[PDB]
Amino acid sequence: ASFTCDMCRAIVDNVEQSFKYTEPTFCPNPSCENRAFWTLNVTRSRFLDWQKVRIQENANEIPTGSMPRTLDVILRGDSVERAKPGDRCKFTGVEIVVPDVTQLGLPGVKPSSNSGVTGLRSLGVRDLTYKISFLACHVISIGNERDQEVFLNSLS
Amino acid sequence: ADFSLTVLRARIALLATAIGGPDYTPPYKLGDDCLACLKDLKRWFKLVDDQQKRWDVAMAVAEYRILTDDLLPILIDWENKCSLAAKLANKAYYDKIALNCLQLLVLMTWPLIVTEQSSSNQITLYGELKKHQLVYKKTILSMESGKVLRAAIRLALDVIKIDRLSRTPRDNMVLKLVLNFFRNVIAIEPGEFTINTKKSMPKKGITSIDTLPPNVSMDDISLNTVISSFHKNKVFGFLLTLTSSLSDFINIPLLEIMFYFTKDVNQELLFPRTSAGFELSKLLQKEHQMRKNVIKHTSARHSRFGGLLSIQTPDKTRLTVSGSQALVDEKIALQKLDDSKKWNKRIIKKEGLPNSLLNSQTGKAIFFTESNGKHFKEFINNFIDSGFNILLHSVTNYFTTEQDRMVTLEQVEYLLFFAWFVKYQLLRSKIDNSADIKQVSEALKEVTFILVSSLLRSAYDLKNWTVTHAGMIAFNELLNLVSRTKAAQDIEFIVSRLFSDERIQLLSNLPKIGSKYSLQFMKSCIELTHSVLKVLEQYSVNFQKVQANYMTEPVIETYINFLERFRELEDDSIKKVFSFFHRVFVQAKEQALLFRFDLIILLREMLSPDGLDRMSRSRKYVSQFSDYFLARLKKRLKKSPAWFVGLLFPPLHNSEVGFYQRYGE
Amino acid sequence: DIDPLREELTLESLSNVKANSYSEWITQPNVSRTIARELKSFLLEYTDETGRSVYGARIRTLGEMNSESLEVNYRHLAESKAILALFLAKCPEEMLKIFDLVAMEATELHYPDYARIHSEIHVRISDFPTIYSLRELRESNLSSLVRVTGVVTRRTGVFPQLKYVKFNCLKCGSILGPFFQDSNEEIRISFCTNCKSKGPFRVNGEKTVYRNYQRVTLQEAPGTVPPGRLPRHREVILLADLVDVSKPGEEVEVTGIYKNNYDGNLNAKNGFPVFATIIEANSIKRRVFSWTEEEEREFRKISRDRGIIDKIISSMAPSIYGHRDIKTAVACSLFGGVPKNVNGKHSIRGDINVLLLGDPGTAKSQILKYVEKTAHRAVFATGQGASAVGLTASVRKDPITKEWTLEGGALVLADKGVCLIDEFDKMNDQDRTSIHEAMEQQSISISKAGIVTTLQARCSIIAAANPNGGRYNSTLPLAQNVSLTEPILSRFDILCVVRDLVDEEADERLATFVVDSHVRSHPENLNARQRRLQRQRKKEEEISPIPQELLMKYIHYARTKIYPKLHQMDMDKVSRVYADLRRESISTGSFPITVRHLESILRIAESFAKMRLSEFVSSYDLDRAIKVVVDSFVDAQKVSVRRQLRRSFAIYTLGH
DNA sequence: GGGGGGGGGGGGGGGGGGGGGTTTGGGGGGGGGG
DNA sequence: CCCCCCCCCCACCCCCCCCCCCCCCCCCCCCCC
């Protein structure tokens, strides 16, 4: 992300993002006083194509035909929109925790109102809970051409 | 008023369109009056930004991208023109626009400093202006493998061809400006994130120190790209033949280039002293030791499972802690109770020069590509084998004069140059018998010692701690070299009396003061002190008399405060500290001065399972020291139970009891 | 050398972009002033091949309509000053502000004081060459101009929205200068610029101005979305002149800006800093029936051919061999009668309803699929794919307002059009019963969830059905051939009975025609594109007396402009026909001749006169209408009586 | 040459102000009657 | 066996928190013994 300060038109840039939409804490200009008042420069900031997909336990692998277990999966970049509903897929990527971003505190949103963890400064009195999700870098399924040249040029 | 700034930016934008552009009939093509436009842009820099101290033109010129989008195209196409013409031999005019492009590059890459004398506008604009210089450095190094670098050397070659006298003041200046170009291109570096301190900090600190512009990565700016582009443009060949040819108007910039090449690179990285995977496996085993350590310090069950330990003290009172591991290990319980305290002692704090070995974090390293490693080490090798003594004589024979007027930056960079290449040649000559200590003989020539002494003495008297630290490093390498040549052998005895009396005292006073200054300052004090003691021992005016000047409590404080960083220190540094302790405690036997609790704490922490490496040679030295130290502490306490109180405190400078405390009759 | 308030650049300098982003270049003031001059020169000097200035004529028309919108064709801007086309593509938000100022300048030049009629002009970027489907949009399209296909799925109300708004600080000297409102977020005032501090803020009631606003949910066309996927959608936002240019359940093609914004809700529920997105529409196009003055003159010219009716009827579904009574009924329905209301007291259906009842493989469904392509407003529904509410109208509780609102069914969407109902025999009767009101009273009278109202549903219904058991059985009368009851059957005021009789000389001509049609439709079968269109035109002329492209505009023209009158019709001819048809319809199994069938004769005679573009109904139109209805009745009979009925009614038909 | 006192910086505490915290309709599945 | 029914599912005060201000402590520098 890239931001410009409200009271001086300096620009902060390459702000790494946590799970919350994250804004700068200090202004880079020593002549400026600011903390936490910003406008996002859309054209300078960098975005990734993003797509959450939810998976459930494979039909033959459920131990006795019971309710399957579920998991949230994140696709990004060129891997988005390759999967489809009802498709049976193999994924690879990272198993990750995802905090309750509302409980962590988020601009324009209230904290959400078994246990979490507290004491961390951003929470104050609150206590934070985590989901588990899979951050996928590659996906494939494990379960037409109308001209001769465009088909034949794909063959060995 | 900002109306002036937008008018200025409109003017510079119009000038940006006057320089030229691509011709679709793609090649870059100059504009009409292009030479006059380049001169007018140079005139804008002078007229406004220099004469009024603004940097507004230096910002506007970056906004309209003139350097990357016009000047380097002009220079690279002119380079191709002259290259092809050289093989196949109105250049009289196009030479002029190439020269004025070089002048503009030297201006726009000119190093930035901020001080109390800078205008408010300049220090406000400093950050983004630095960022634009980084984009310039990236473009200069990258574009057509940095062909503009060969353009610069060709512009210099076209005045090196003529006679030594035939190089007029304009030709001398042109060569100097080419050197300033190469210096600047080396010298651009990311700026410091500089924050206003009127308003308090939020509940979180600065989110990140990263000050790069979005189109730059740090690898674009790294030395590796410099080495690659300089090699592929033979800039190293240009500098090597230039320093060989010296037979002095340009000598100071020529020194300065080598400083800027050396200021932040460590000599050992050029020497080895499945290989990558093998060493990675070694690294991973080393940090797996810390994994098993924290695992020992971790509960076998979930965080909500915690029962309560109670530590009943030796008195009839009780404390409480929740640590499940601590419940079966009172050491953890005690230290965890201490960790729990909200209170801390508040600690008090603690520019016109670049980052270097003077101020970097002590483990920092440039991770070369092996091709760039070979190219750089062979370049500095051939420099040492040709250019070192001649260059050092030329510039030191300058610096004999004008010491009163030598700017602080110039002093520190000269001292770092001296130290870096002397240290390198000593190391290479330890590795190669083919390399000769005499190839840096200029370092030991007595004018050099006298000047370095004048620099350190004046810096310390002036309390210029920056230059004092630089001279301290240079002294360390001078003494290091002296020891090597004393073994390899006259001049040794000359310096070993010239450094007498007040110089011995001065060197004895740096490690008294070092405890008040940064880790690198203290490290250089320790290094200097170890070198000084081995030099004096190698000679051995009196040996007992000199070392008594070091064995005093503020020096012990400096050694302790250096040693407090033990995890971040290197094994050899800990070895030097404990060799000094070996001298003080075992050899000189002034053991009372080290019976103080700070050392006891630090010894336990480093001998801890989460302390040093179990396999470290320095751990073996610490263990040996600790065994003897504890035995003597037990013996002294048995002889003198008053020391159970005295252990807490500085020793009694009241001599009438102080002698009894020190020796116990 | 030059005034900084008037410094300006060359066109090659504009090609030589030397700010970092495009927007940073557009906002450089010398570049901006140059761009203004460039677009002004473009509008005033780009021409038709006739030499007539394009935007001179479009501006002249804009003022005549008192419009706020100017349709700039992008391909014109790509032909001349193509760099501006590039900037317009890569950086539309800045460019369109400049181009709006330029367009207002151009029309103010053309019309003095057009600032009194509208204080602003918006350029509409027509004919943008690259197109995306909703699945196809990505981060790399963010802030780009885009051209998108979809169907408008949910259209909200025409609300006011802030455009230019001065604000009041409730501390200090209150007023703040006018902020410009976007389509994406509320205005934020971090601090009051007078007192340079925080405070409360409020809208200034004197100096604030409003524009129209309307969100639309745009969704993937069902004839585009691939299998195995959920259809994708985006919230389009319409502003100012673009509100209510479309209605739900219709395809649109949308030129706009794909813009993102922060939303704490999306971040909250997804747990990542993921932004919402819209398409801020710059222009909307529905997706043939529009016609020119020369086309109007062409319609007049061809209509006065005394053979035009049969040339139209032959042109109906041209690749369907024979079935001339179906094509007649389809022609009559598709032109329709004239709706009427006597003194406001007694409204009368103008639409003509047609039922195609017959055997399998007799092109009934394909005839409906032909009409679906041919009519201006139409929709197609099949059997168990329909529901009663899905057919007439329905209600839903709006998730925005939480109030109940109607949503139109098929017979609302096809209002003033025709509705196509395939497999009418195999709908549920609890769906079929919904047809009755709309089919005759031309209305739908909902009373549900507090809503109580009557909607207009002016549709001609054309229906296709198989007889009982599987195929027709002419030993029986109609009431035993089909499960449908007399009320619904009486509303279908022409019946076509279609039978698949084996007949050698008919089958050979049919089979030859079908085979010829198949090869004439095979894929492989003045530049290259135009040349194959000319061959295509001759292929169409192989079977069609008039082009389908001409016929559709001719239908739409005849429907919308022509209103026949029954001036001096033969009353007693019709009355005797109705009297005899009623008497012979006393047979309890036959097609129930009713007063609405007498009206059918009159509607049909008007429809034939409509095909002639005729202000007056002739005897020939009325005779043909009688002959159509008499044939429809006579063939709805068990064969034991059909010959006698044919002989009796021949006195009325065989005069023509 | 060391210790006290004066002066300036930096950190912590305490107070004050502010914002947040069920009916109706429709489709499809599933079961029962003619 | 087929169709209809009916059942399901779904759309003003008090606490936490943050900002601002004032005092106190700790270090450094200079003078006195």
Ligand SMILES: Nc1ncnc2c1ncn2[C@@H]1O[C@H](COP(=O)(O)OP(=O)(O)NP(=O)(O)O)[C@@H](O)[C@H]1O
């Ligand atoms: N006269 C014809 N001319 C051309 N094609 C015909 C003709 N009659 C039937 N067909 C073909 O028959 C096929 C099926 O037509 P279709 O419209 O389904 O007839 P249908 O009467 O509606 N049958 P059904 O759906 O069982 O009631 C199409 O592919 C037509 O091309």
Ligand SMILES: [Mg+2]
């Ligand atoms: Mg059909």
Ligand SMILES: [Zn+2]
């Ligand atoms: Zn700021």
Ligand SMILES: [Zn+2]
């Ligand atoms: Zn205010």
